[PDB]
Amino acid sequence: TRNGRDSESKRLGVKLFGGQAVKAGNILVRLRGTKFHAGYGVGLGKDHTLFAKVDGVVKFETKGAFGRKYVSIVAA
Amino acid sequence: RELIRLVSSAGTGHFYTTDKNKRTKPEKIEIKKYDPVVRQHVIYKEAKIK
Amino acid sequence: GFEGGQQPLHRRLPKFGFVSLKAMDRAEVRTSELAKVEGDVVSLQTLKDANLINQHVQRVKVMLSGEVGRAVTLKGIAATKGARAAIEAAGGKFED
Amino acid sequence: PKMKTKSGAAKRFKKTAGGLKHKHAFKSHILTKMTTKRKRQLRGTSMLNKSDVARVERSLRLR
RNA sequence: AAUGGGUCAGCGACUUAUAUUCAGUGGCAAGCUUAACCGUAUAGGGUAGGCGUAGCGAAAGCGAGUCUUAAUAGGGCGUU
RNA sequence: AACCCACUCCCGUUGAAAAGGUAGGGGAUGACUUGUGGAUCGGAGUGAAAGGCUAAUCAAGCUCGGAGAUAGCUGGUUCUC
RNA sequence: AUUAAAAACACAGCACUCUGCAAACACGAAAGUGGACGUAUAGGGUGUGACGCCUGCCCGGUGCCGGAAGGUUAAUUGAUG
RNA sequence: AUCGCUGUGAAGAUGCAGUGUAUCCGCGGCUAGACGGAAAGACCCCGUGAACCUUUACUGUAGCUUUGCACUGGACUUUG
RNA sequence: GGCAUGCUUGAGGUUCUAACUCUGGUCCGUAAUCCGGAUCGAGGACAGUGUAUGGUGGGCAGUUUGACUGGGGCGGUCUCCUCCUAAAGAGUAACGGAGGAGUACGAAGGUGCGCUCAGACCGGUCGGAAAUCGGUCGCAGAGUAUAAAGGCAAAAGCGCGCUUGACUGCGAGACAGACACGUCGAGCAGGUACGAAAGUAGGUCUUAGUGAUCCGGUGGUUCUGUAUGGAAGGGCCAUCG
């Protein structure tokens, strides 16, 4: 019945938007279960964190079947 | 889940530490694990942390 | 130290070691200083005759921090590898 | 000597030429819950960052 | 229509000591500086001691490196 | 009646009075009233008990020290651009 | 004492309980002193409060009194490892 | 150099706005206002304030009590 | 089995007198109800006192007795996770609206190989809407250890075979962030799982499942080790309360 109780608001979402230069370890998307999928040179960590495996710029392409949003890094 | 100790079958005194549900799996654990003091994989077989 | 009432840093982090009583009488004298003693010898009492090292020091190591200048003799005094090289290069010698 | 360093601060913060060293919390007495990756990364002796320096070396009587 | 003061004239509140840090300003400079004390005594002497010339490590120790490490790999701190 | 007390009203409240006056009231041979001298004193006395009293002071007198206690509180902080 | 004189306190009477005397008890680091130059019809504590009629039930809690002797249990002992 | 009203306003105005009244100054009275005067609100809150009382709060202590070892001995008997 | 006794010791009872006690008598100091001394008496190794120790002990003492709060008291709530409020990046308050957690798991982990769920339908000789299947339509609505949200075909769902990577040392670089904490992680070295091999594997679909320091305990250790050789204690590393 009685009612308080929130939690500490985990700061999720898109870091490193769609034209930005990335280094080879940077967190792309903090994610709660794959909104965005792992593209060309990006990694998919344990808690579905997208991180960069190479350098370049972020792409954010909507590719393929299943309508999936991909974060990929184009070496440019 | 009371915690146990898994000591190395090799001659060292190296131990990995974990839990176990005693009232469902009471027999001891003989899992092959990596010992750093000899630097090979050996069986670990122990309980009784005290 | 007081942080308003939370646990301050000097009570929240652990204590980490001991001080050696072995090293209260320890000393180091670098190679820039060995030309400053008189008498073409670097001894413990000779390093105390100049003010290069305190009284109540007993162990001196010589390390390499410059140029030795002269050809001095180091009795009873340890030296590092590069410092023994640079002392014996410019005419020095070494006994005990 | 007419300034007393806090003795609990001297046991916690050894001074080097790189700053003031300290050890980490959480590596005591609850070490099965933690992964090895957490116990590996609290093991060393870290530096003391900017927000803490003025307070610690005011406690360690150096300001 | 909150406090304070009837008014005047006197008085009445960031000091001092000792340790230290930063700035400014001087002296000496890989060195600088003395404390007690001595002194026909603000001189001169007294360099014991303090800080600097090297760091790393909890330490032994080793040292332009050192610690961790199985590692001459990585990494931390350091080095005209 | 003296004496001792203090129930009521009114006055007085900057009083004649830091607890009274005037009218009335209670006891008045007793568990009475009183002089003089003495005893008990500060977590300590004495109390037919009310936290009463202990020098106009009392849920711990007064004075002097620790002492310039302490105050995250209040008040104040003095010439000029 | 100085806003409460009362239904409050006290009281004779009552009951409980303690105390065999160097008393229980009180004040006293103690000596001592009060109780008391008294002695159970005395003395302390407690509650009730003349008188008249009375004063019911409960011994689980807690206290107080007595009881075996079983478990527990302190210093001190100091076997053995 | 101290009016009334209606507003306004730290929100109940002699002092603000607008507007009415009102020659200057006493004396005797009366108290409706000057949130009148008297007491750094007693109620309420707050202070990591205090005091004193309570207890089956915590921690102790006086006193009372148990045993050991001293002061403290011999002699017998029961007994391990 | 023990016969007997002494060389002893430990607990009781009774007795004795000599310690001790007497707020008993009588002398004496002395002209003294004090106090000593002598003696008689009585108790008696008890009493009592010192020290150690258990018990009792508001008789007395020093304290404590939380905060938030539409004033305070009462109730409720304090840490952590999920959604809304939250204004389409983060963040964002209320005694605002809703729910959860203080764990499970040695397989519910790893890997290789394989496979899709659920639902209507129509089928009556115990179940009759229903179990077991044969799936035509199907058309993610199933499942996921657990709340909610977000995700799942390379399924992250499901089955089987092997198995320990629920490794050690680290760690480029980021996310978060006052600090202490926290989150993700390519790669490198050493050894291993599976797989023919590319490769995957540093736990679990993801985010809760927790707790600083100081004290102690335990196992190592290259370190220290108060004259020296050792120990004691300390230090570091791992771990427990």
TrEMBL record, chain A:
The keyword Hydrolase does not apply. GO terms for cellular component: cytosolic large ribosomal subunit. Keywords: Ribonucleoprotein, Ribosomal protein. Transmembrane segments: none annotated. It comes from the Bacteria. GO terms for biological process: assembly of large subunit precursor of preribosome; translation. The keyword Ribosomal protein applies. One of its GO terms (molecular function) is structural constituent of ribosome. InterPro entries: Ribosomal_bL27, Ribosomal_bL27_CS. Belongs to the bacterial ribosomal protein bL27 family. HAMAP family: Ribosomal_bL27. This is Large ribosomal subunit protein bL27. It comes from Pseudomonas aeruginosa.
TrEMBL record, chain B:
The keyword Iron does not apply. One of its GO terms (cellular component) is cytosolic large ribosomal subunit. Keywords: Ribonucleoprotein, Ribosomal protein. The keyword Ribosomal protein applies. Pfam families: Ribosomal_L33 (PF00471). InterPro entries: Ribosomal_bL33, Ribosomal_bL33_CS, Ribosomal_bL33_sf, Ribosomal_zn-bd. One of its GO terms (biological process) is translation. PROSITE patterns: RIBOSOMAL_L33. One of its GO terms (molecular function) is structural constituent of ribosome. Coiled coil: none annotated. Belongs to the bacterial ribosomal protein bL33 family. HAMAP family: Ribosomal_bL33 (MF_00294). This is Large ribosomal subunit protein bL33.
UniProtKB/TrEMBL annotation, chain C:
Keywords: Ribonucleoprotein, Ribosomal protein, RNA-binding, rRNA-binding. GO terms for cellular component: cytosolic large ribosomal subunit. Residues 37-95 form the Large ribosomal subunit protein uL15/eL18 domain. GO terms for biological process: translation. Belongs to the universal ribosomal protein uL15 family. Binds to the 23S rRNA. Part of the 50S ribosomal subunit. This is Large ribosomal subunit protein uL15. It comes from Pseudomonas aeruginosa. The lineage of its organism: Bacteria, Pseudomonadati, Pseudomonadota, Gammaproteobacteria, Pseudomonadales. The chain holds residues 49 to 144 of 144 of the full protein.
From TrEMBL, chain D:
PROSITE patterns: RIBOSOMAL_L35. GO terms for cellular component: cytosolic large ribosomal subunit. Residues 1-63 are annotated as: Disordered. Keywords: Ribonucleoprotein, Ribosomal protein. Residues 52-63 have a biased composition (Basic and acidic residues). Pfam families: Ribosomal_L35p. One of its GO terms (molecular function) is structural constituent of ribosome. GO terms for biological process: translation. InterPro entries: Ribosomal_bL35, Ribosomal_bL35-like, Ribosomal_bL35_CS, Ribosomal_bL35_sf. The keyword Transmembrane helix does not apply. This is Large ribosomal subunit protein bL35. It comes from Pseudomonas aeruginosa.
